[PDB]
Amino acid sequence: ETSYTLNEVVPLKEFVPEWVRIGFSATTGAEFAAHEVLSWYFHSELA
């Protein structure tokens, strides 16, 4: 029940190549935490 939503217009064709890879990254520096993913689902459709 606690939610955070963000919406933005982002013309992807202007910024990214036609073929891409997708994924996750995380970092620590002088402070830290464990960053872990438990599950992942993805669906894309190009007409």
Which residues of the shown chain bind other proteins in the complex (CB under 8 A)? 1-13, 15-47
CB of 25 to other proteins, least distance (A): 4
12 phi and psi angles, rounded to 5 deg? -45, -40
CB of 9 to other proteins, least distance (A): 5
Q: Quick check: 26 and 35 in contact, CB under 8 A? A: yes
CB of 12 to other proteins, least distance (A): 6
What single DSSP character describes residue 10?
Answer: -
